Assembly symmetry: C2
Homo-oligomer: 92 residues x 2
Amino acid sequence: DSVDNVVSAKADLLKLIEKQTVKGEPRFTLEQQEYLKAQIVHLPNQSEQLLQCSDAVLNDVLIGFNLNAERDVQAEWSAISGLRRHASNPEV
Amino acid sequence: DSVDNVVSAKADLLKLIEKQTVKGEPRFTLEQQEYLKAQIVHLPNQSEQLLQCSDAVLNDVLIGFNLNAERDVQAEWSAISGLRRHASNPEV
DNA sequence: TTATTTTTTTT
DNA sequence: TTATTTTTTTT
């Protein structure tokens, strides 16, 4: 039901992949551990999903789909790209 | 056409009401000057009109029309009442 | 051929 | 009679 537990449980799973040991030796090699962690995905609500994406990624997406060109996207994304930097205020 | 000139012209009119002199004496008494300035009004766009209103005034309005009671108003007005304090960022 | 930067307000 | 504080996501 709760986001706080979805994220907590996901982190515990990654931790378990890190530190699970059998006969006293760590169960997975590093390439293996990166493999399993690759398979897990987490799906927040849309707004938080956006705010997770770094500016480089989203700019890359805008370029790749040439959506960098049209005005409404650029104005909107500029405003959002800004507020991040002062999201420390809960009101922001 | 331009807001910068509407506000500039209004301020010049108030200044003229202040300092217009006839035969070397100031044309209007203080109660007169407050009278004329009472008659002038200025009508910005809606958003700036809101941001001019002090929190006390808008809270008084919300109370007088009991709109203080309903949730959407309070959430929205709280958010706006906040951002003002950090409107120094143009992005905000 | 001609050859840019622009304002305002509301939904 | 019974007697509150609550989460999440999208439009």
